[PDB]
C-alpha cells in the first residue's frame, strides 16, 4: 500500500 | 528504522559519482527501497527504485544508460552509480521506503 | 506520463484552523488490485520529506490524528483538523500506480 511495489512500470 | 545516505559532492559534467544508504533498524532484505531528487526548478523526482531480492528495477527517462541501482543484503546497503553526470542532476538525493528517508546527500554538477 | 496537480501553491493559516490540500490526478490512479496509489508527504523546513498519509487514506505510525486523506480515483484532498506550528511546511501529494510521479507542492505558512 506505501509503494506499487507490482507495478506494471518496472523493466 | 534507520537510513543514511553518502557519496553526495561537487564534480564537473560528465563525471562518475557512486551515492551509498547504509541501513539499520529494520529488515534491509524484505524492504522495497527508492532513490529521490530534489532540484530547485524540477521539484520532487523518482530517479531510480529497486525490489527487496532484486528481479525488479526503475530509472526515469531522464536516467536511463547512464544511472545504476543495486543493492548488496549481506552488508544492508542501497546504491546508486551515477555516470555521465549533467547539470540537470543537480539536486539532493533522498534514499527511501517511502516511510521512511535519510537525511540526504547533495549532488553538484557544474563547470 | 502522470501529472499531479496542486491548484493552490500556498496555504496560509492560523494555529488552530483546519485546512484541506488537494490534489487532482490527470488519469485514475486506481490500479488492478483495487487499491489507489496515492501518498501524502510534509516537508519542514531545512528537513528531508516524511509520509503522512499512504493509499490516500491511511495514516502512517506515529503521525497525529488531525491529518487525514480522502478522494476519489482523480480528486484526493489532504485534511489538518486544527494546525500547529509543526505541521508547517510543505505538503506533496505523490502516486505509484503508474511510473512514480510528484504533484508541485503547497506551502502551508502562517496567517500573521
Known amino acids: 500500500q506505501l509503494i506499487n511495489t507490482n507495478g506494471s512500470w518496472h523493466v | 528504522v534507520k537510513l543514511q545516505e553518502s557519496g553526495g559532492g561537487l564534480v564537473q559534467p560528465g563525471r562518475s559519482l557512486k551515492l551509498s544508504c547504509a541501513a539499520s533498524?529494520?529488515?534491509?532484505?524484505?524492504?522495497?527501497l527508492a532513490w529521490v531528487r530534489q532540484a530547485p526548478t524540477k521539484g520532487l523526482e523518482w530517479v531510480a527504485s529497486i525490489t527487496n531480492s532484486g528481479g525488479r528495477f526503475y530509472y526515469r527517462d531522464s536516467v536511463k544508460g547512464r544511472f545504476t541501482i543495486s543493492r548488496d543484503n549481506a552488508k544492508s546497503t542501497l546504491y546508486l552509480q551515477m555516470d555521465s553526470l549533467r547539470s540537470e542532476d543537480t539536486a539532493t538525493y533522498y534514499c527511501?521506503?517511502?516511510?521512511?528517508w535519510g537525511q540526504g546527500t547533495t549532488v553538484t554538477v557544474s563547470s | 506520463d502522470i501529472v499531479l496537480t496542486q491548484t493552490t501553491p500556498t496555504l496560509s493559516a492560523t494555529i488552530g484552523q483546519s485546512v484541506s490540500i488537494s490534489c487532482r490526478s490527470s488519469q485514475s490512479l486506481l490500479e488492478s488490485d483495487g487499491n489507489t496509489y496515492l501518498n501524502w508527504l510534509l516537508q519542514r523546513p531545512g528537513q528531508s520529506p516524511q509520509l503522512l498519509i499512504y493509499?490516500?487514506?491511511n495514516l502512517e505510525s506515529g503521525v497525529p490524528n488531525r491529518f487525514s486523506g480522502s478522494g476519489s480515483e482523480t480528486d484526493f484532498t489532504l485534511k489538518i483538523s486544527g494546525v500547529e506550528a509543526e505541521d508547517l511546511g510543505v505538503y506533496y501529494c505523490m502516486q505509484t500506480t503508474h511510473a512514480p510521479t510528484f504533484g508541485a507542492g503547497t506551502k502551508l505558512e502562517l496567517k500573521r
Open positions: 533498524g529494520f529488515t534491509f532484505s524484505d524492504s522495497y
Open positions: 493509499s490516500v487514506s
Open positions: 527511501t521506503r517511502m516511510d521512511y
